[PDB]
Amino acid sequence: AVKKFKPYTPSRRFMTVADFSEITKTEPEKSLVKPLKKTGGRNNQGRITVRFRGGGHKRLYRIIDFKRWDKVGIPAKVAAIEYDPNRSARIALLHYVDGEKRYIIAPDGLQVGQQVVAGPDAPIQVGNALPLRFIPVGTVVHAVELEPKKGAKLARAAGTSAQIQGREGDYVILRLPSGELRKVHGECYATVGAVGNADHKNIVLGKAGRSRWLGRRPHVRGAAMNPVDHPHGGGEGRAPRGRPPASPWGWQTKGLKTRKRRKPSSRFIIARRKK
Amino acid sequence: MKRTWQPNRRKRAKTHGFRARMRTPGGRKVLKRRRQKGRWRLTPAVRK
RNA sequence: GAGCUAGCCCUGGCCAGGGUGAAGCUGGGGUGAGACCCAGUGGAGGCCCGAACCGGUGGGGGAUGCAAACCCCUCGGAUGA
RNA sequence: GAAUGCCGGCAUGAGUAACGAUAAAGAGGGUGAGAAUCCCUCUCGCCGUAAGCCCAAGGGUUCCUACGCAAUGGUCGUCAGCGUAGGGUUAGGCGGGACCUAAGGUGAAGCCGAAAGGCGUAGCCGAAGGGCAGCCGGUUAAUAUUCCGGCCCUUCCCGCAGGUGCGAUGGGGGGACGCUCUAGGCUAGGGGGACCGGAGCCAUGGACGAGCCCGGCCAGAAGCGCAGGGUGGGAGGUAGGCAAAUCCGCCUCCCAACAAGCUCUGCGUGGUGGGGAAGCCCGGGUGACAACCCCCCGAAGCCAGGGAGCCAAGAAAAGCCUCUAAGCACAACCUGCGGGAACCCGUACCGCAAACCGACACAGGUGGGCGGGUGCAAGAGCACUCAGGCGCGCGGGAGAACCCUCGCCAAGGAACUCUGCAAGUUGGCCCCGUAACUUCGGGAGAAGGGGUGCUCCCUGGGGUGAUGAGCCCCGGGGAGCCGCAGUGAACAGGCUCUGGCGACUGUUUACCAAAAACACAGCUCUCUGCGAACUCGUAAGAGGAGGUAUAGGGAGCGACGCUUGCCCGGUGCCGGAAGGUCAAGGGGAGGGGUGCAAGCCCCGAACCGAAGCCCCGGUGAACGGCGGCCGUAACUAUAACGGUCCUAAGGUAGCGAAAUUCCUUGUCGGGUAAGUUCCGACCUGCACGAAAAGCGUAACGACCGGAGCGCUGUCUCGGCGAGGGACCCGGUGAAAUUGAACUGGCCGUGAAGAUGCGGCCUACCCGUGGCAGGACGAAAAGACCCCGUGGAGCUUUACUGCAGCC
RNA sequence: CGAUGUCGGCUCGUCGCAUCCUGGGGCUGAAGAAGGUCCCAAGGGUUGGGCUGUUCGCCCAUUAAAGCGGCACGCGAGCUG
RNA sequence: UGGGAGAGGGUGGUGGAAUUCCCGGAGUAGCGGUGAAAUGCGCAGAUACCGGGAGGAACGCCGAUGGCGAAGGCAGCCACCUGGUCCACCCGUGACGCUGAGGCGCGAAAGCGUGGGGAGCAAACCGGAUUAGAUACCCGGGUAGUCCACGCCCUAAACG
RNA sequence: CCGAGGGUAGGGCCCGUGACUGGGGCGAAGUCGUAACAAGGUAGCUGUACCGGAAGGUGCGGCUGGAU
Numbered sequence A: 001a002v003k004k005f006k007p008y009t010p011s012r013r014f015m016t017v018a019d020f021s022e023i024t025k026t027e028p029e030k031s032l033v034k035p036l037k038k039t040g041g042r043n044n045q046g047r048i049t050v051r052f053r054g055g056g057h058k059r060l061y062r063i064i065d066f067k068r069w070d071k072v073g074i075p076a077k078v079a080a081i082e083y084d085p086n087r088s089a090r091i092a093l094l095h096y097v098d099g100e101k102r103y104i105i106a107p108d109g110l111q112v113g114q115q116v117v118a119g120p121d122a123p124i125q126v127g128n129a130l131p132l133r134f135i136p137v138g139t140v141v142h143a144v145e146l147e148p149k150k151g152a153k154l155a156r157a158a159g160t161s162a163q164i165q166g167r168e169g170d171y172v173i174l175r176l177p178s179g180e181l182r183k184v185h186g187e188c189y190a191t192v193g194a195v196g197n198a199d200h201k202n203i204v205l206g207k208a209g210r211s212r213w214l215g216r217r218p219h220v221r222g223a224a225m226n227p228v229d230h231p232h233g234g235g236e237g238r239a240p241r242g243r244p245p246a247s248p249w250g251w252q253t254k255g256l257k258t259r260k261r262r263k264p265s266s267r268f269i270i271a272r273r274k275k
Numbered sequence B: 001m002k003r004t005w006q007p008n009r010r011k012r013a014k015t016h017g018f019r020a021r022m023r024t025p026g027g028r029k030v031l032k033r034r035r036q037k038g039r040w041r042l043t044p045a046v047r048k
Numbered sequence C: 001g002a003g004c005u006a007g008c009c010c011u012g013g014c015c016a017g018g019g020u021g022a023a024g025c026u027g028g029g030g031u032g033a034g035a036c037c038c039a040g041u042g043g044a045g046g047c048c049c050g051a052a053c054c055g056g057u058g059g060g061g062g063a064u065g066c067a068a069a070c071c072c073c074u075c076g077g078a079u080g081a
Numbered sequence D: 001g002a003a004u005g006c007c008g009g010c011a012u013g014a015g016u017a018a019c020g021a022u023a024a025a026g027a028g029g030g031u032g033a034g035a036a037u038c039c040c041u042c043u044c045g046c047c048g049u050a051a052g053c054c055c056a057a058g059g060g061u062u063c064c065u066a067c068g069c070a071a072u073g074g075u076c077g078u079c080a081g082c083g084u085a086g087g088g089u090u091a092g093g094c095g096g097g098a099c100c101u102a103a104g105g106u107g108a109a110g111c112c113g114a115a116a117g118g119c120g121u122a123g124c125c126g127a128a129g130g131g132c133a134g135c136c137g138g139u140u141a142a143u144a145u146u147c148c149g150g151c152c153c154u155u156c157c158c159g160c161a162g163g164u165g166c167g168a169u170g171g172g173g174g175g176a177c178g179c180u181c182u183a184g185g186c187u188a189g190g191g192g193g194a195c196c197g198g199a200g201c202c203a204u205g206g207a208c209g210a211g212c213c214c215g216g217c218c219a220g221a222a223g224c225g226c227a228g229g230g231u232g233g234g235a236g237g238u239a240g241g242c243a244a245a246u247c248c249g250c251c252u253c254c255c256a257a258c259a260a261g262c263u264c265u266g267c268g269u270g271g272u273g274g275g276g277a278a279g280c281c282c283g284g285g286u287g288a289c290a291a292c293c294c295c296c297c298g299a300a301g302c303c304a305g306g307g308a309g310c311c312a313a314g315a316a317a318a319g320c321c322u323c324u325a326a327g328c329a330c331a332a333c334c335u336g337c338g339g340g341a342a343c344c345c346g347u348a349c350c351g352c353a354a355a356c357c358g359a360c361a362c363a364g365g366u367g368g369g370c371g372g373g374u375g376c377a378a379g380a381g382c383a384c385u386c387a388g389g390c391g392c393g394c395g396g397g398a399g400a401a402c403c404c405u406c407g408c409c410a411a412g413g414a415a416c417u418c419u420g421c422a423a424g425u426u427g428g429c430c431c432c433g434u435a436a437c438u439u440c441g442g443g444a445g446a447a448g449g450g451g452u453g454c455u456c457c458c459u460g461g462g463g464u465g466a467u468g469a470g471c472c473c474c475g476g477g478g479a480g481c482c483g484c485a486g487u488g489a490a491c492a493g494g495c496u497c498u499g500g501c502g503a504c505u506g507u508u509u510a511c512c513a514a515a516a517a518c519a520c521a522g523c524u525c526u527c528u529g530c531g532a533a534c535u536c537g538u539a540a541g542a543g544g545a546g547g548u549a550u551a552g553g554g555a556g557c558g559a560c561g562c563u564u565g566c567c568c569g570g571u572g573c574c575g576g577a578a579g580g581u582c583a584a585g586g587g588g589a590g591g592g593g594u595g596c597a598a599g600c601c602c603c604g605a606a607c608c609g610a611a612g613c614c615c616c617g618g619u620g621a622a623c624g625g626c627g628g629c630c631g632u633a634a635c636u637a638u639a640a641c642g643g644u645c646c647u648a649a650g651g652u653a654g655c656g657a658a659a660u661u662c663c664u665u666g667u668c669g670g671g672u673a674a675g676u677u678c679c680g681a682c683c684u685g686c687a688c689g690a691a692a693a694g695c696g697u698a699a700c701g702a703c704c705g706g707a708g709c710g711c712u713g714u715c716u717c718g719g720c721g722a723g724g725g726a727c728c729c730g731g732u733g734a735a736a737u738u739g740a741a742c743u744g745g746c747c748g749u750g751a752a753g754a755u756g757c758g759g760c761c762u763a764c765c766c767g768u769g770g771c772a773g774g775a776c777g778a779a780a781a782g783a784c785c786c787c788g789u790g791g792a793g794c795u796u797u798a799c800u801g802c803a804g805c806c
Numbered sequence E: 001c002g003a004u005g006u007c008g009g010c011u012c013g014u015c016g017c018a019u020c021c022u023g024g025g026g027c028u029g030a031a032g033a034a035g036g037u038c039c040c041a042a043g044g045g046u047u048g049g050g051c052u053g054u055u056c057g058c059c060c061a062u063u064a065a066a067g068c069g070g071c072a073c074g075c076g077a078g079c080u081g
Numbered sequence F: 001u002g003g004g005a006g007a008g009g010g011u012g013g014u015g016g017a018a019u020u021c022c023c024g025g026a027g028u029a030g031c032g033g034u035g036a037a038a039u040g041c042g043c044a045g046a047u048a049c050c051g052g053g054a055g056g057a058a059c060g061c062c063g064a065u066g067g068c069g070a071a072g073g074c075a076g077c078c079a080c081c082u083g084g085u086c087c088a089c090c091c092g093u094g095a096c097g098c099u100g101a102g103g104c105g106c107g108a109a110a111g112c113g114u115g116g117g118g119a120g121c122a123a124a125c126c127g128g129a130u131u132a133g134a135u136a137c138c139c140g141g142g143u144a145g146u147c148c149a150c151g152c153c154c155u156a157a158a159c160g
Numbered sequence G: 001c002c003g004a005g006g007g008u009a010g011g012g013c014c015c016g017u018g019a020c021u022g023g024g025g026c027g028a029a030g031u032c033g034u035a036a037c038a039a040g041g042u043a044g045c046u047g048u049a050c051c052g053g054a055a056g057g058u059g060c061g062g063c064u065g066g067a068u
């Protein structure tokens, strides 16, 4: 997991890459890919609305099945485990005995050639999807819907996972990857297991070009700009912030909470995130 | 060195052309003015 | 007004030749098994030398110019952000 | 009569600078009123990964011919991209359209917006991407994959034969894909041949030769051959592919498998049709019944959708094949053959440039393809040269200063100077050899060396082929030869030690700064639970992201190593259901105006009453800050120690005269003959110090210091030489500037620096080449400075307001 | 202030004399030699380096001596930067 | 061959007590702390008490002068994997033995790297007190660390 | 041809010396505290870590060479 390189260039000395061990098929399912429109950080007005985006590798989007509750009871076999450039996790190829093929994000431990299935009667086994109501308390879980039938929303990043802390009426108490304690409706589906590729965060990009390959253009510090451009702009020689550190748009960027006060979902967050 | 006028017939027609002018309210007032002035051509010539 | 310029998007194209010789793999040695070491194979890299191409470091010339930024000598990159 | 006035005319500078790359010219013969300049011939030179050829943009008749020379042409002109006229561009197959989709654009549905308009699913448009049928030669003054010839092919319509469950905008397959590296076999292209064809040639000492010189092919249907690509066959089940499905997907079984078969391309052959040199004679004719063969080299191109490896994980849609649906199965489709039909637009010419973009016939800029030969290790590098194209649209002289570009130089060798700036030196390949340090890769081409040609002899291995010859490719040893010199020309690093800064490759002020600045992997803080935060938008809607805390925003810092101390009083931010204040609103004690009154109307106390602020806490990789005086040791000096004042706390590790040190060239040491710089130390740090990070750090650097070796015209100190100018003659002929001028020196004077006033002195009239002291020389209504209740960018705890948020 | 280009260097000089040297001289606490001090004198001369942008200055090695100053802190339509 | 004892080792699972936090209730004027105090927490409702939840670390009694291991060391319970060892029978091989420079491996705690984890504890640090001072002992806080995985470090009054 | 050696260049070992700097030893009657020896007035020693004018202190683990 995570391969190193000998320092035969300045950049190889620190660069690391994934081991790609679990990957078993190296070209995507043609029936399940569609062209991804690279945005460059621009919106329909043509304006950069997220800065420092663009110019990365061409990618094809793999259609992922974030519902799984639309094929209740229909088992499937894990046919392959593949690279997906649109997310940190790996994806798994399912051959349903329907003959339908679908993609899911690969949980940790899921072995090619096993069966998976979804529904209240499903075995509490890695890769199976159940309504949260029916998963035993204490089970680690991933790809969790937030509202029933609206699609897997929580814990789909490499290595992430929620845990079931308890049950309260129609709502189960989840410990999200943030550390937040949230109530999620019991009818919401979730896949037992943690997301695989947990070594994803131990990758060292190694050089600037690697960031360029990911579609990540250079980020320029406020301090390096002029007052026209940024609160931190200007000054003769270097300058400290000289004011509470701020974004380009003037709002404070150290500590200033920004979650909407009167949001209706506050009724469902028990404890804000940890650390 | 590379100067500013790099002619391109498609670009010229799709930027200043008659149909480009008629799409937008500012563009139709250009044509309106240029008639009132009596311009011999309301629009740049481009040989297509 | 983005036919200059700046960024992004889509679709194409281009980068002589030469050098260095990563992982891996194979054989051998090593060991309880290993780690590992040796050779061969291999052909990695914002790797090296250098045209095209992209630049514009230093100096000279030019200065009612060949030119409203050019010329010469020199110099940077040249599979990559 | 003045406005650096406006328009126009004409002067001055002036027969002055210049006439646009220093690739280069000379003569002869034509033409003509006229010729350095046009035509022809011979000689000479220049480009040859181009300065040749073919496309695409753009340009728009510039193309071809005839007749012209006023202007355009930097001179000339008989010439021309100029003037006049006439002529010239031919396609089912090439390009685009009648096909497809990409970003994007537009947009029935729908959404949004005072209006204008903004969004937006399907659909539509949209190309240098996908798809699709023409190759070779000939012909014109000028077009040709277009005309003609030969041999091929496509689609549509109709018909005929055979065949089949036919039928689609619906389902499915396919199309359909990256980067690097790369196999086999071909082809393009090329080298050689003592073989084949050819008009000739024998010079000037030799050669009648296995001599020299020239050429030795191109296209081609079926078929066949070689080399590749693609592709399992069958059955049963079936709940998925939004109807259906015999297809596709999934499961099971049998058979075949690294083949074969089928199929598709490439190449070869191929009926046939073309081409065909030097030389000689006048673009042509002959050469010629031209010959058309053998060997070698050989792609980056072809087979191709080949193979392998890698991570950053690599369009779509149609054509095409398959499946069925309505409907139809006298139809329809498939296959073959036949006849018919096959439209629109482009087509001249320039196209790295005199026709494009630069006001110019402008040393600049402009995408793709071809780009031969020899040698130099390779190559598109370098020199020469083929095909082909040019000598750059002023010339002739002269042989001054001076300037440019260039060559050489005695002795010295950085003494030059801010600085080795500049220019030397070094320079390719092979081999020997190569240090500190290090992150073990590097440093490294370290440093420093030796070799390098030609001849003869012996010999090892590979490719091709046959295992052989021949050809070609890597080598090994031995003996010699010549010169000053053998990468004999051309292209091709000077090196070392030591500091600062930045880790690094990158990036930047287009047009004075490339850097130590920006970025950068990496570290930390912070926000964000998803209709996320954040951004753009009045909105709808977008981006974020078809992502989901290993994610996304923001901020600092900036590989890595070792680290990052104390202060939460103030500001910020976070937490705090109490308290205090607090607006609209609730409340209505108590008043007031008015009316005959019922009433109508106005004011209004306590009290209830949000955020915000106050208040209580937390918080530094949040904004930030991190003391003073006095005393004290058994020589002196210094002060571990003490006293006291203040603070929120009094700067810790490390570093230090520093990119920071004022005094300052601090002091001491090193280097030098001498060192305001440099390096190493000391520490009374004017005024380092820990993520505006502190201290280090291998490697990297067109960064900035210091030193040394090498070598030099940088210098002592200059000399000579070359070419392009300057100069003279012929042709063409600007410019800024200019109150007018008959425009001297000194000493004075003058608004305080006088050609112009005074006094003296000096001086015949006018030029030409030169030099720059003056004309407070030119240029630009001073950028500095001030003024203006002139302007703009920027900031904030200035004022006031607005967005946004609460 | 409708512009008088601003340090220093280089180059090129020229002038003043309050003279650094060389020439002439008086006084000396001048034995000689070598000095001191003042007077006359501007004809000529007045070095090469290290350091720093430097002028200046310090230093090395010499010298007869290593003078001071003016010329828009002489001299950028002469160069440097 | 048959047996036996054991905190010997490794992997995973899991059980209760306790501490801390958080929610709910009930309740009031103090709590805590010491030599005595102060700091601290507490009318914004603490302490004490009940129920609910979260999380981490350590395993009470058994337990001993005990057991195991070569040493360092090892203690809830369970399963798997695995080492040493003792005894009985006198069955097998027939000196196959002892030691052991180098080598290799293991090696408490602290410490280091990369992730996690973080209740209690607690270097550093802050505050209270003491004191001449108090960079200490004592008290209120408190960060690394203590815990897990992987990799290092290789020390010891590593002692009988 | 070899060849003393001379020259150019780069390495290794040793010695002497160096502004300044690090601790060490020693030195009749210096300054600061009082860490250790008694339970030395906090049992001591310890490996390590961090801190502190200084002895030392504190954490974690160990030892008794610990008083009762």
Ligand SMILES: CC[C@H]1OC(=O)[C@H](C)[C@@H](O[C@H]2C[C@@](C)(OC)[C@@H](O)[C@H](C)O2)[C@H](C)[C@@H](O[C@@H]2O[C@H](C)C[C@H](N(C)C)[C@H]2O)[C@](C)(O)C[C@@H](C)[C@@H]2N[C@@H](COCCOC)O[C@H]([C@H]2C)[C@]1(C)O
Pocket: C063, D779, D780, E003, E005
């Ligand atoms: C190459 C030719 C251009 O001249 C120059 O560049 C000169 C070197 C330029 O000087 C440079 C170089 C300089 C170092 O001084 C020598 C610097 O001081 C001035 C500022 O700028 C002239 C002297 C320079 O003039 C000097 O300017 C400074 C400010 C004041 C001087 N004055 C003191 C004499 C004057 O001589 C100017 C300003 O450059 C000349 C000015 C006439 C034109 N300036 C530029 C355009 O700017 C105009 C003003 O707006 C910026 O172009 C000029 C003039 C047209 C020229 C003549 O074309």
Ligand SMILES: [K+]
Pocket: D784
């Ligand atoms: K100023």
Ligand SMILES: [Mg+2]
Pocket: A003, A004, A005, A006, A012, A013, A014, A015, A016
């Ligand atoms: Mg690595």
Ligand SMILES: [Mg+2]
Pocket: A006, A007
């Ligand atoms: Mg390594």
Ligand SMILES: [Mg+2]
Pocket: A018, A019, A020, A021, A022, A023, A090, A197
């Ligand atoms: Mg993987």
Ligand SMILES: [Mg+2]
Pocket: A030, A033
């Ligand atoms: Mg598709």
Ligand SMILES: [Mg+2]
Pocket: A037, A038, A039
């Ligand atoms: Mg998008």
Ligand SMILES: [Mg+2]
Pocket: A044
């Ligand atoms: Mg759009």
Ligand SMILES: [Mg+2]
Pocket: A045, A046
């Ligand atoms: Mg728009």
Ligand SMILES: [Mg+2]
Pocket: A048, A049, A050, A051, D535
């Ligand atoms: Mg933005």
Ligand SMILES: [Mg+2]
Pocket: A040, A041, A042, A048, A049, A050, A051, A052, A053, A054
């Ligand atoms: Mg962007």
Ligand SMILES: [Mg+2]
Pocket: A086, A087, A088, A089, A156, A157, A158, D551
């Ligand atoms: Mg993801």
Ligand SMILES: [Mg+2]
Pocket: A082, A083, A084, A085, A087, A088, A089, A090, A091
């Ligand atoms: Mg993945």
Ligand SMILES: [Mg+2]
Pocket: A146, A147, A148, A184, A185
């Ligand atoms: Mg819900």
Ligand SMILES: [Mg+2]
Pocket: A201, A202, A203, A204, A205
């Ligand atoms: Mg990382």
Ligand SMILES: [Mg+2]
Pocket: A056, A057, A058, A059, A085, A213, A214, A215, D312
């Ligand atoms: Mg990417």
